Ligand binder design. Structure first.
Ligand SMILES: OC[C@@H](O)[C@@H](O)[C@@H](O)[C@@H](O)CO
Ligand SMILES: [Cl-]
Length: 294
């Protein structure tokens, strides 16, 4: 029969909503629970680990029909996802590869990370130095994306990751990424001594790209993931060093998660992960990518 959540209460917990991917996935879950007739209990951690734990505890005390957790550092949330299951509460996730989740809605990040890395390598001629932002390695999709970069360049050994990897941050992501790249360009002033800057998601990319323009170092190419509109439009600008951004579908991911909650409560067994396609946008493909998202 048609899916429904009538009479159900669904806990919806996100690590934050402070940029495109997170806001989209969060809102679309809330929307979808409502559209299926369920009652969402939606809690935003504002990117505090303390608030994230505290709101999951409260959702647990509420004994909703399911909890969906969006993003977060796996070691931070895992004890609470376990507690929820132990309390009798079905747990699903978005971008969290937990043993305690019944189903993780996520892009196929092996595909994403490999595709981005191969683009990067091809773009720089198989040779040169790469500045890497790797500040969210504790977050499943970012860990996978980083692992794939490492693994792709392993087989193109004239490609090197510059040492001290940088740590991107949230919030203040753009201003911080701008400052870090600005300071690193001053360590490596010689044209050609950096060829790319990689990030696991595209808001640090945005900071990076800006710092390149400001510094007069646009020979350097930038790379990222999410397809936030503000960054896609940089990729589309020939005069921008933003070279590639793998677009994700966060509203689709959020709807899928809730679709999968309904399926679970109706009795069906879920696959452990459910992959939503992603689309690599480079300077040639961004138009057809941007159009498929709008
Ligand atoms: O954990 C940071 C970041 O990767 C996420 O907030 C989001 O932007 C997506 O890239 C996750 O699929
Ligand atoms: Cl320039």
């Amino acid at each position: 029969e048609a899916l429904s959540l009538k009479g159900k209460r669904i806990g919806i917990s996100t690590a934050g909503t402070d940029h495109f991917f997170d806001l989209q996935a969060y809102n679309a879950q809330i929307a979808e629970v409502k559209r299926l007739g369920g009652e969402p209990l939606a809690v935003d951690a504002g990117r505090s680990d303390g608030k994230l734990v505290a709101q999951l505890q409260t959702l647990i005390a509420q004994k909703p029909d399911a909890i969906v957790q969006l993003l977060g550092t796996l070691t931070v949330i895992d004890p609470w996802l376990k507690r929820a299951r132990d309390a009798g509460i079905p747990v699903l996730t978005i971008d969290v590869g937990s043993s305690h989740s019944l189903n993780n809605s996520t892009s196929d990040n092996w595909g994403i990370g490999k595709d981005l890395a191969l683009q990067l390598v091809s773009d720089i001629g198989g040779e040169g130095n790469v500045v890497v932002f790797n500040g969210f390695y504790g977050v499943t999709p970012c860990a996978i994306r980083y692992d794939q970069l490492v693994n792709v360049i392993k087989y193109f050994p004239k490609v090197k990751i510059i040492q001290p990897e940088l740590r991107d941050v949230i919030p203040n992501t753009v201003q911080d990424a701008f400052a870090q790249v600005t300071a690193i360009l001053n360590k490596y002033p010689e044209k050609g001594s950096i060829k790319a800057i990689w990030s696991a998601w595209d808001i640090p990319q945005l900071g990076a790209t800006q710092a390149l323009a400001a510094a007069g170092r646009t020979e350097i190419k930038t790379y990222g993931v999410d397809g936030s509109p503000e960054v896609l439009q940089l990729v589309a600008d020939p005069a921008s060093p933003a070279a590639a951004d793998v677009a994700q579908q966060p509203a689709e991911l959020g709807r899928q998660a809730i679709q999968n909650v309904a399926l679970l409560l109706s009795g069906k067994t879920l696959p452990r992960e459910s992959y939503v396609p992603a689309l690599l946008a480079n300077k040639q493909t961004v138009n057809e990518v941007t159009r498929k998202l709008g």
